[PDB]
Amino acid sequence: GLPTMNTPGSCQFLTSDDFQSPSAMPQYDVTPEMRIPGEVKNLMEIAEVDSVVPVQNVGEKVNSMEAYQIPVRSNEGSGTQVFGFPLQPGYSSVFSRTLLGEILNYYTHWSGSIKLTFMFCGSAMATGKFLLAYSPLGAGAPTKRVDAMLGTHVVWDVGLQSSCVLCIPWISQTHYRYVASDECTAGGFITCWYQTNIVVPADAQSSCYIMCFVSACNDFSVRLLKDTPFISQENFFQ
């Protein structure tokens, strides 16, 4: 009998522990593996895939398919704001239910760039130019197009390719920004403006729609995995 000492914490149960334990059945012959398509090795790869954004999440719109659609129309004066949403994907209502947001609700810290994709859904004849802008934290949200232009922005033109990508650079003092809203780290403000008035021929509709898609970039990463807020059970299901 070799002399042995017992460490503090002997005979304790840790959820996240990795140890060797004896199998219930000795020498079981497992069924042979077969080739299956879409094999998954990382959660991040699922987050890279674009997800439709319910940008118009107000009132009845979430109940209809109108949540995803963003309204646009020909207008008398250029410079009106199409929409505005918070930069963070995890806490904001607009990005909380999307593919990337749902994965983030699972993890405490998030890092890296976000790609936003905008596809015009109007008639071929319809033409227009919009200004999509991201404003860095610690500056009040832009209230006019001139203020928005100071923040980094991409000017988009309808026609030719019908979709545009605004890529938001990561600009954080910290390496990681909390998924839960944090007073210390504010992600930013994202807003859209009319670069020019929408123009249509007679017999073509004045008003069209624009869908938004949100995804993790190559630099994106997560940490400190945690239980998700949305899923709860009053009782075990039957």
Binding site: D18, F19, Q20, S21, P22, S23, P26, Q27, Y28, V30, P37, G38, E39, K41, N42, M44, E45, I46, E48, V49, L160, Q161, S163
Partner: protein
């Protein structure tokens, strides 16, 4: 037959593991398998598309 492997450490250190069972289902999990490939889910389409060319031509 002891196996020596690297530990999980920060950037900018080895742990010995010995199997004491033959069931092979009694082993520890393979936490250190950091391989990813988004090619399946993203860029699914047959004809390859370059980063800066018109998408449809």
């Amino acid at each position: 037959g002891a196996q020596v492997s690297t530990q999980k450490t920060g950037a900018h250190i080895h742990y010995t593991n010995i199997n004491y069972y033959k069931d092979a289902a009694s082993n520890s999990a393979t936490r250190q398998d950091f391989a990813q490939d988004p090619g399946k889910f993203t860029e699914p389409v047959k004809d390859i598309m370059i980063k800066s060319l018109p998408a449809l031509n």
